[PDB]
């Protein structure tokens, strides 16, 4: 019934990269959502109220917070498993660089994951990449900011202007957050 | 023990690009040797003709070496995957095995042997796994893009190396 | 006298990638102003009211027609002469792209400053003793732009949704 | 009878980044040799023999050390004008970057450069280049190799395989340059 588009990170924080990428993800792969999974490290309320305010305008993203769940999975295997067992109606795709597994040899625990869900791999307009594996392609203009850039910009009181939503600058500043 | 870093791929055909990754995360990850591993379809270029144009593009390197276990996983009864057959007949060695970052910001656990990633300097990966990273820089040249050149008739030099480009001319290979 | 950093452009439509570079120079080399300069030769109207709108938010951001005015019927300055002309004792610097290549030559006999930008870590070499702005790779630009208003594909993260939103209802880009 | 490519850098030292940026403008551009053009100090004499050594294999490259002259031209226009006096039966062309004019105003200086001689605008496979000036393109493959990459590496005694011919890392080594 719906295509889902499974986005994982840190999100710490989210920004206009990141908001970009699963847009043309989105798009291209014809998918009717994509769903922002944070990941966990074994502060994340912020990272989650900060997802929320950057997501809110785009009807076609979600937050998805299984990994934020008590006991709940973290390798991918596991979180995909159950996504897919509480979502069983649904077609899951997972979103990866398209050149995470290209020098890779031949792998079995690869081949079962790939096979467990269908991978989007992301890469620039253009070029190739070569190994061949079960993948669907999406091109991605490329837009260089990353979280840690970003945190650092804050920590040095550096302008973060078209890098972040003002929503998420705003929460930062209230919230004292990389100072 | 030796630290050996492994490198997958098709190599139809190797190039400068394969090289330069390999000698980075040879030096900047502190391994011995990098094992260069040509993959084969299941029969749906010709593997000795990858593997041919993989020793010229070696040659040089003292620590590059070609290996075809992914070339013999096949027994009588059972058949093993590259990484698994690899542990087998090298277990007191140290495999590191190269995953890419350099699309995405962030690598997800989805694994459960070592493993090292490649990026592009200056680029910023966050990932769950405590990760060693190669800083590699950027060459924006691949076999296909290069099969295209051949074929089209448009230059290869810089991209590839001469040994490799006179076997693709000796041999006829990509129209 | 102002710091003035002068950003020529089609601006056919003005996007992200054109904010985040003023801001970067503005901020890196310390300046108190950049001014868009549309050239002339998409209709100037439309540019120039697109260019308003993706500006307006930013403070430091000015619109800038002179090179609109060059002409005096009997003369025709270029766009550095009328400025020279009509702010003889501000700081008037030009952006240099230095990010395709390696070098930087000496082409011009250098008021009137330059600033180099070019993404961070992309190291440039010059005889000019020149400052260098650190600007984020975006890859977007105008003709990208008009292309995805073409064949429908999105624009969302690229232009300001006030750009997209006057590119619509003027039924701009076919 | 000639088409010229005018390729100017420190070459300092001259890298693979270099030999193929050049080879693929010779060939995108349609022209017959690119000349290397070691730019004035604003020493020489290792630059130049590296560059002689970086380029002996390819038959479509030259030397141009007209920069080099006492007395010498250093500002585009008069070392182009020089050129163009020189050579004038052929056609030479100005290699830069795509965007290094890509924001600047309209400016009768630069279109004086421009109509002295055909710019060349290099610049990555993709990507468009607004510039309301002439300028014939050419796209090279991204070589994130530089000059400046390469001497810090033969300071920390970083490898440098792939990245500068091998005759070029053998002048280096005997003559103990780069290791400051």
Redo the contacts between chains.
């Keep these: 019934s719906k295509k889902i588009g499974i986005f994982?990170?840190?999100f710490?924080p989210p920004h206009?990269?990141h908001?970009?990428?699963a847009?043309?993800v989105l798009?291209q792969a014809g998918l009717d959502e994509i769903w922002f999974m944070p990941?966990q490290?074994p502060d994340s309320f912020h990272r989650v109220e900060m997802l929320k305010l950057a997501i809110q305008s785009?009807p076609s993203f979600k937050l998805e917070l299984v990994e934020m769940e008590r006991e709940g999975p973290?390798?991918?295997?596991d979180t995909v498993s159950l996504l897919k067992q509480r979502y069983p109606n649904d077609q899951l795709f997972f979103?990866?660089?398209?050149?995470?597994?290209?020098?890779?040899?031949?792998?079995?625990?690869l081949?079962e994951?790939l096979n467990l869900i269908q991978f989007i791999?992301?890469?620039?307009?253009?070029?190739?990449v070569?190994?061949?594996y079960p993948l669907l392609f999406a091109d991605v203009?490329?837009?260089?900011?990353?979280?840690?850039?970003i945190r650092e910009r804050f920590k040095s009181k550096?302008?973060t202007?078209?890098?972040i939503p003002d929503k998420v600058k705003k929460y930062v500043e209230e919230n004292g957050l990389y100072e």
């Design positions: 994982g990170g840190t710490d206009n990269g908001l970009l990428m847009n043309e798009y990941n490290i785009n973290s390798y991918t295997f979103i990866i660089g398209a050149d995470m597994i290209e020098y890779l040899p031949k792998w079995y625990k081949d994951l791999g992301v890469k620039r307009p253009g070029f190739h070569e190994t061949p203009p490329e837009f260089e900011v990353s979280s840690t850039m550096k302008p202007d078209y890098l």
